[PDB]
Design a protein around this ligand. Structure first.
Ligand SMILES: CCCNc1ncnc2c1ncn2[C@@H]1O[C@H](/C=C/CNC(=O)c2cc(-c3ccc(F)cc3)cc(O)c2O)[C@@H](O)[C@H]1O
Ligand SMILES: [Cl-]
Ligand SMILES: [Mg+2]
Length: 213
């Protein structure tokens, strides 16, 4: 048995089927009264919600699905016809994310891509029929935010106005990523101070809007 399986089971037993909000609530409740887990969480999730609503992205890429909390959170706010692609290298977690999304009734808005971002990103145009991304949410291994951002650029997947939203830029921290988007003329950046999921440790998200090269 694993922590991720317990979280799924808790949602399946307590949340309301086909109700994405009840899924988020049940995951938060589990993590608030039982085992901590690395979901973006409710505080940072409010900022995520705000960004999704403001920019109304038709195509979103998520790096790092984990239990699918962020996938549920973004997907539930997407406009009809809009789509989310989520990359997850761990097949156990990909399987959990799929069951979470199924439960939430969001399976038709989300496609889970299995594998590591550095290998999937270069297949997006040919294999998954992507032109450009409107939004990217980064929440995978922290030392990979910068390399994956450069890879997305190199592959021609960013357009002017593409919104990158990055979790955990303070804790655990993505100092290299921040130095890059804040120093580069190719991004205009806005920092959102909040709190780490399920506690009062200060963390934040960085919003970095691609300007073109
Ligand atoms: C080298 C491969 C990089 N490419 C990748 N491609 C696809 N999926 C990837 C992935 N890397 C990681 N993943 C997956 O993303 C998820 C990993 C996320 C890493 N997250 C964290 O480390 C993290 C950690 C904390 C944390 C904060 C404070 C603390 F004391 C302890 C932990 C808080 C967070 O909000 C976090 O997001 C997993 O599901 C993993 O399988
Ligand atoms: Cl929270
Ligand atoms: Mg995170």
């Amino acid at each position: 048995d694993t922590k991720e399986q317990r979280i799924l089971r808790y949602v399946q037993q307590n949340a309301k089927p086909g109700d994405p909000q009840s899924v988020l609530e049940a995951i938060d409740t589990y993590c608030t009264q039982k085992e901590w887990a690395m979901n973006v969480g409710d505080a940072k999730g409010q900022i995520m919600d705000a960004v999704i609503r403001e920019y109304s992205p038709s195509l979103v890429l998520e790096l790092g699905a984990y239990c699918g909390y962020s996938a549920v959170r973004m997907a539930r706010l997407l406009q009809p016809g809009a789509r989310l692609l989520t990359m997850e290298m761990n097949p156990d977690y990909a399987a959990i994310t799929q069951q979470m999304l199924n439960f939430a009734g969001l399976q038709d808005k989300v496609t889970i891509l299995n594998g590591a971002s550095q290998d999937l990103i270069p297949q997006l145009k040919k294999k998954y029929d992507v032109d450009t991304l409107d939004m990217v949410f980064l929440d995978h291994w922290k030392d990979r935010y910068l390399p994956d951002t450069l890879l997305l650029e190199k592959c021609g997947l960013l357009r002017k106005g593409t919104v990158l939203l990055a979790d955990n830029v303070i804790v655990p921290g993505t100092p290299d990523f921040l130095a890059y988007v804040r120093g580069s003329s190719s991004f205009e950046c806005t920092h959102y101070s909040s709190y780490l999921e399920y506690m009062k440790v200060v963390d934040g998200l960085e919003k970095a809007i691609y300007q073109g090269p």
